[PDB]
Amino acid sequence: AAVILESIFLKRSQQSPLNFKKRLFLLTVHKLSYYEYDFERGRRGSKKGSIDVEKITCVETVVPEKNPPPERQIPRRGEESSEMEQISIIERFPYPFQVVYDEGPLYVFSPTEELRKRWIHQLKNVIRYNSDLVQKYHPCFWIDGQYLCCSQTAKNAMGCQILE
Ligand SMILES: O=C1Cc2cc(OC(F)(F)F)ccc2N1
Ligand SMILES: [Mg+2]
Ligand SMILES: [Zn+2]
Structure with missing residues (x-):
């Protein structure tokens, strides 16, 4: 099914010290x-x-x-x-932008604001018919076993802030 976007991004790998790796992402x-x-x-x-x-x-x-x-x-x-x-x-x-699924958040870093905006806008479009969209999210990164935004210690913790 057609390529919507294709970009080289820095992503935080799942775990040890955090690891970041330069990878090609295909939507x-x-x-x-x-x-x-x-x-x-x-x-x-x-x-x-x-x-x-x-x-x-x-x-x-x-x-x-x-x-x-x-x-x-x-x-x-x-x-x-x-x-x-x-x-x-x-x-x-x-x-940086975050893709939340079951496991919890995937952290991806974009080289430009315009590229990040496009990826977020196209991702929202393709997930519009998704069954489990949440109206709550974490505005800060999960680091050292907890979310900076609300100090919760389950990666799948309900979001501390509501979405507009
Ligand atoms: O170490 C990693 C980086 C990563 C990205 C990801 O999201 C995916 F596939 F790119 F959509 C899912 C799992 C993992 N594990
Ligand atoms: Mg240089
Ligand atoms: Zn939070």
Whole structure:
């Protein structure tokens, strides 16, 4: 079923210290998938996983990390080169969004706000007919065994904030 979006994003892996990995994400009408990227040949490398779109309960932005490492900091502008600074789009991923399903949240970092907006808008569209949409979500990341927003310690805890 047609490719809706295809992007290189930094994702937080399921667990140990948190691990972030640069992966290609593919949205079709029924599946969200991710791949090791084959940079040299310009293709999808090895498929690493998939979830059914119909298992998604919620998709929203995530309050940014207070102390992000450089890989997730917003570029200052002109600190890399004099003009045409575009390679940041595969080097820096400071705009995070979350896909909630049964297991709890998947954290994905987008290199630009516009790309994050498109992914959220297209994800909301494809999950509109989902049976288990929640009207409550966590605005902050779950880190060190709890959600920063409400200190709850089940990854599948009901959201502490209502959705508009
Ligand atoms: O380590 C990981 C990264 C990841 C992403 C994910 O969502 C998916 F497939 F991309 F839609 C589901 C499971 C996992 N486990
Ligand atoms: Mg660089
Ligand atoms: Zn919360």
